[PDB]
Amino acid sequence: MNLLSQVSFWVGCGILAFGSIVFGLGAWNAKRQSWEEFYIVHFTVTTVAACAYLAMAMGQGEITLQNTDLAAEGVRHIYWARYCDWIVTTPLILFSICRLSKVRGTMIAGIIMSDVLMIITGAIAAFSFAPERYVWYIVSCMFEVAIFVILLGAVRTSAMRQHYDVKNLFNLVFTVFSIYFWAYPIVWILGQKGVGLYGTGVESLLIMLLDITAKVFYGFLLLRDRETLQRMGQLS
Amino acid sequence: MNLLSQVSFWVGCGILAFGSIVFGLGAWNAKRQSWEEFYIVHFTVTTVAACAYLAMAMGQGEITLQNTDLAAEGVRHIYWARYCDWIVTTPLILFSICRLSKVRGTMIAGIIMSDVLMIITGAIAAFSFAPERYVWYIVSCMFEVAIFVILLGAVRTSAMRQHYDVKNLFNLVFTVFSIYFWAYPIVWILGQKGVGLYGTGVESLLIMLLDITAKVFYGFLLLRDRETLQRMGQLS
Amino acid sequence: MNLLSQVSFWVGCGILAFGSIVFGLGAWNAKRQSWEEFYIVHFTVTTVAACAYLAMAMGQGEITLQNTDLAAEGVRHIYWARYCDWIVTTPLILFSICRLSKVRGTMIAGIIMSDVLMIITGAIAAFSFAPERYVWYIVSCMFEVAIFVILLGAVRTSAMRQHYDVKNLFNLVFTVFSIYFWAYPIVWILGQKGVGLYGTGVESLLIMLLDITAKVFYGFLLLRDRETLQRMGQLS
Ligand SMILES: *C/C=C(C)/C=C/C=C(C)/C=C/C1=C(C)CCCC1(C)C
Ligand SMILES: *C/C=C(C)/C=C/C=C(C)/C=C/C1=C(C)CCCC1(C)C
Ligand SMILES: *C/C=C(C)/C=C/C=C(C)/C=C/C1=C(C)CCCC1(C)C
Ligand SMILES: CCCCCCCCCCCCCCCC
Ligand SMILES: CCCCCCCCCCCCCCCC
Ligand SMILES: CCCCCCCCCCCCCCCC
Ligand SMILES: CCCCCCCCCCCCCC
Ligand SMILES: CCCCCCCCCCCCCC
Ligand SMILES: CCCCCCCCCCCCCC
Ligand SMILES: CCCCCCCCCCCCCC
Ligand SMILES: CCCCCCCCCCCCCC
Ligand SMILES: CCCCCCCCCCCCCC
Ligand SMILES: CCCCCCCC
Ligand SMILES: CCCCCCCC
Ligand SMILES: CCCCCCCC
Ligand SMILES: CCCCCCCC
Ligand SMILES: CCCCCCCC
Ligand SMILES: CCCCCCCC
Ligand SMILES: CCCCCCCC
Ligand SMILES: CCCCCCCC
Ligand SMILES: CCCCCCCC
Ligand SMILES: CCCCCC
Ligand SMILES: CCCCCC
Ligand SMILES: CCCCCC
Ligand SMILES: CCCCCC
Ligand SMILES: CCCCCC
Ligand SMILES: CCCCCC
Ligand SMILES: CCCCCC
Ligand SMILES: CCCCCC
Ligand SMILES: CCCCCC
Ligand SMILES: [Cl-]
Ligand SMILES: [Cl-]
Ligand SMILES: [Cl-]
């Protein structure tokens, strides 16, 4: 295994496990049901990812596949543990944003469905040879568009409607999510699974940076935002 | 791949994707929550199947297995993508019928459980050699019986009790479902997985006709029925 | 296959199928929704396990793997059908105990999450070589600790708070569960997957005895307890 990959996995595991300690002890100490739910959701997020990173750090959850002539020179290292992690953790992150926005349940169900299909077709893409890999990559990207038509549409609207004097708070919530979410397909397609701009070591580093941003630091941002809304009296 | 199979997959993909356009744009435009839920459920149904048909059309999601002497002459083409599709789409079709009938949640949970086990044991059957394949086929058929004791019993009863002057409407809902649902195990057992009456091409054509009936045209029937009930004032 | 294994699988299948008859006919005959839910949950428990035992009895659902020098002499027989069964049946048993205790939903979600991760890391452990197998075994055991901090904490507390004059009833509910639940990791680690104290035949017998205890006889205990609470008037 690439050394940069090896190190990125151990570093992601430890950072994610730090988040699990914060969220887990928060759930243990929370008295209000809405804080128990928040912490339990975000504890699952970091803990599932921390398990996936532990497996990759130990040399598991990976399969190496040959590339064709319609692909980058060499091979692709498919860390299928990533998609097992993502199919569970990304619907939970979206669920958390939706609960903070207080949006109706039909939008929650629609955004979770779009997200699960985005991940599933992403994993099909990763295992596919070209040109099928590229067809599935585009299908996965269109499911990502459907996530954002729901998020920046009905979810954001319900967030602005049911809260007062917190436009900048929710703007940061949706803007920061929007940025790291769109970075994943870019990081993916610039590696060996698309254009051979960089190899599996750099890709592993970039994904790890995205993962700790989305699961630990973004979680802390939603935590702080919940505190702000509670001190204002518009949390529940 | 068989040409009739190849064509049936492309034809099913396009027809299913037509349904996804109808249901998806209906969800986008729906103002009432109960219409949002209806369209989102049926959009998932056609879209998941359309993805499975795209994979099979492109030559993926299939494994060919040898038959024993207790089986039809030749081999069996197992399109395992079918069961990944079915384990998600058939509980959603049943959920839609149950919501239209306004039945209590315990019956919804019971019918979904029976259905998921029907599909799982069906996939075990398909991967099994004889005689195990035949044992699992019978077990799967008994789970299908359990679906209908719930459907034609408590679900239908609650549909007739909580609605007025729409006996013929609900009769068609349960009768049309009953017919295509029982056709699947027949189509399955007359192909190479049971009696060798026809090969994988004809079976692929028959399944595709069942799939577009159940997911597109039956969906349009439930759509029209929802409109009828709404114009009568007994939708919610 | 080991004869003791062969017999234990057929015996477990028949005993589990006996439980499915009791719980299934109870669901069919139940008039109150809360009894319908109880029977449907416990019918799923025995029926899913009975399917898994039928597969193992017929020689399916098993893979044999080589052991290293950091492991017991010989091989490990991994019945992966067990974990497919467990990932579905153990969250349902916990759900049933939580509903009987009338605990808030956040605790139900937390205990189900801990349980699913316990089973998943257990299956990773089983497929892993040493030393990874031992790392995952410990991780799985820590998820089991997290189940019991929730169960003996918030769930038990809510059981004592919302019921009168039934301390001994609930004490038996949590004590009997506690005992068989902790026996599983012990049985697992004393077989070929840990210390080579006994082989796959004895392990298969011990698991089968645990499985019928947890799914049939413990189910009958919760049934009798529900009857007691109903005759007292504190069931719902
Ligand atoms: C904690 C993990 C997170 C936030 C992961 C997010 C993942 C995505 C937004 C995935 C995107 C993909 C595409 C739209 C297509 C190409 C492949 C994927 C699966 C990386
Ligand atoms: C859109 C897909 C639909 C409506 C599929 C329905 C599938 C079934 C009713 C499956 C039935 C099966 C049996 C009862 C046993 C033999 C194999 C199966 C899985 C085809
Ligand atoms: C009906 C099945 C039941 C009650 C199964 C319960 C299973 C467990 C408590 C599993 C425990 C495990 C560990 C904590 C680690 C080692 C391996 C497992 C998965 C056996
Ligand atoms: C000792 C090396 C064996 C390699 C195979 C062991 C199986 C590893 C499975 C890892 C799956 C990770 C998914 C994480 C999501 C919870
Ligand atoms: C959403 C349900 C559809 C399930 C279809 C799974 C297809 C997986 C295909 C994996 C690629 C293997 C063949 C590679 C051909 C380029
Ligand atoms: C519902 C959980 C049970 C999971 C059992 C999976 C069994 C799959 C067996 C596949 C057939 C392979 C062996 C073929 C022997 C005829
Ligand atoms: C990794 C830090 C420990 C995490 C503990 C997770 C369990 C959460 C407890 C939920 C409240 C239980 C109080 C009875
Ligand atoms: C405020 C009420 C929230 C209810 C959430 C229900 C969402 C269920 C999602 C299930 C997965 C998506 C299936 C289409
Ligand atoms: C294939 C046709 C497009 C399907 C779009 C699916 C997204 C559904 C939108 C739900 C309402 C969002 C309004 C903000
Ligand atoms: C009208 C209320 C509907 C509630 C539906 C709950 C059904 C949950 C099904 C989960 C799968 C089945 C598990 C046994
Ligand atoms: C194995 C014994 C039969 C089990 C039947 C399971 C179906 C449960 C029926 C639920 C009530 C349906 C009444 C209309
Ligand atoms: C009394 C209300 C019960 C509601 C139960 C909700 C539990 C949902 C569990 C879903 C799996 C766990 C995900 C973290
Ligand atoms: C080997 C590259 C290190 C990158 C660290 C990035 C810190 C934000
Ligand atoms: C090569 C590992 C880089 C670690 C970056 C840490 C960012 C918080
Ligand atoms: C060993 C290959 C496993 C593939 C799992 C894919 C999960 C999305
Ligand atoms: C090759 C057979 C064509 C079948 C078309 C059926 C139209 C309903
Ligand atoms: C061989 C493909 C037949 C297509 C039938 C279309 C039915 C609507
Ligand atoms: C490559 C074989 C996959 C089998 C998947 C079965 C899903 C029901
Ligand atoms: C071969 C050992 C039989 C064990 C039976 C145990 C009865 C409780
Ligand atoms: C060797 C099979 C033992 C069966 C034990 C039955 C316990 C109820
Ligand atoms: C043939 C190996 C299947 C492994 C399935 C593991 C399910 C937890
Ligand atoms: C956390 C310990 C990992 C040991 C590496 C095999
Ligand atoms: C693997 C090199 C041959 C592929 C041509 C598309
Ligand atoms: C305000 C939501 C979209 C922001 C993305 C830059
Ligand atoms: C490989 C066939 C291309 C499919 C385009 C939808
Ligand atoms: C594959 C032919 C031999 C099988 C006999 C049951
Ligand atoms: C009226 C429901 C059953 C009809 C099947 C022909
Ligand atoms: C192959 C054994 C037959 C099992 C019948 C239940
Ligand atoms: C399989 C025997 C060699 C393993 C040494 C750790
Ligand atoms: C009273 C619950 C814990 C009992 C375990 C022996
Ligand atoms: Cl390629
Ligand atoms: Cl055969
Ligand atoms: Cl080993």
Tab-separated table of C-alpha atoms in Angstrom, chain A residues 15-16 18-19 22-23 35 38-39 41-43 45-46 89-101 111 147-148 151-152 155-156 159 168-181 184 208-227:
chain	number	residue	atom	x	y	z
A	15	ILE	CA	-9.869	12.167	13.815
A	16	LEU	CA	-13.186	10.390	13.220
A	18	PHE	CA	-12.271	11.945	18.187
A	19	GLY	CA	-15.616	13.041	16.755
A	22	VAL	CA	-17.529	14.185	21.353
A	23	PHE	CA	-20.852	13.056	19.901
A	35	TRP	CA	-30.304	16.740	21.667
A	38	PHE	CA	-28.794	15.063	17.246
A	39	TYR	CA	-25.888	13.404	19.049
A	41	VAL	CA	-27.234	10.708	14.495
A	42	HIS	CA	-23.814	12.355	14.409
A	43	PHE	CA	-22.262	9.630	16.572
A	45	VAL	CA	-21.843	9.204	11.252
A	46	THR	CA	-18.333	9.392	12.736
A	89	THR	CA	-23.471	8.208	6.649
A	90	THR	CA	-24.548	10.570	3.882
A	91	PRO	CA	-28.319	10.020	4.404
A	92	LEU	CA	-27.743	10.704	8.113
A	93	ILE	CA	-25.950	14.020	7.427
A	94	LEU	CA	-28.824	15.063	5.152
A	95	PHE	CA	-31.344	13.911	7.760
A	96	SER	CA	-29.617	16.145	10.327
A	97	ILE	CA	-29.757	19.211	8.047
A	98	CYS	CA	-33.430	18.490	7.304
A	99	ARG	CA	-34.313	18.202	11.004
A	100	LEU	CA	-32.532	21.496	11.732
A	101	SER	CA	-34.569	23.082	8.920
A	111	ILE	CA	-33.575	13.578	-0.399
A	147	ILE	CA	-30.351	16.181	-3.946
A	148	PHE	CA	-29.641	19.883	-4.429
A	151	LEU	CA	-32.076	20.967	-0.559
A	152	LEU	CA	-31.681	24.469	-1.988
A	155	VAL	CA	-35.484	22.405	2.626
A	156	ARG	CA	-33.864	25.853	2.575
A	159	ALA	CA	-35.564	26.725	7.046
A	168	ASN	CA	-26.716	34.011	7.746
A	169	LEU	CA	-26.712	30.926	10.000
A	170	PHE	CA	-28.651	28.810	7.524
A	171	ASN	CA	-26.785	30.302	4.552
A	172	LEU	CA	-23.555	28.905	6.002
A	173	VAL	CA	-25.238	25.539	6.686
A	174	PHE	CA	-26.289	25.063	3.066
A	175	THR	CA	-23.233	26.757	1.507
A	176	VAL	CA	-20.600	24.734	3.365
A	177	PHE	CA	-22.489	21.494	2.634
A	178	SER	CA	-22.863	22.459	-1.027
A	179	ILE	CA	-19.110	22.963	-1.395
A	180	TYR	CA	-17.754	19.740	0.091
A	181	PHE	CA	-20.559	17.676	-1.463
A	184	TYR	CA	-16.392	14.420	-4.048
A	208	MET	CA	-9.915	11.887	3.969
A	209	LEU	CA	-9.831	15.689	4.179
A	210	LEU	CA	-13.374	15.841	2.775
A	211	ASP	CA	-14.552	13.111	5.171
A	212	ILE	CA	-13.293	14.781	8.353
A	213	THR	CA	-14.689	18.109	7.145
A	214	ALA	CA	-18.141	16.650	6.492
A	215	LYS	CA	-18.406	14.397	9.547
A	216	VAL	CA	-16.464	16.096	12.360
A	217	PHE	CA	-16.120	19.814	11.650
A	218	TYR	CA	-19.478	20.255	9.890
A	219	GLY	CA	-21.019	18.322	12.776
A	220	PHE	CA	-19.512	20.821	15.210
A	221	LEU	CA	-20.982	23.626	13.084
A	222	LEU	CA	-24.474	22.123	13.346
A	223	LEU	CA	-23.901	21.674	17.084
A	224	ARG	CA	-23.057	25.357	17.538
A	225	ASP	CA	-26.032	26.346	15.370
A	226	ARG	CA	-28.388	24.244	17.510
A	227	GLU	CA	-27.063	26.029	20.617
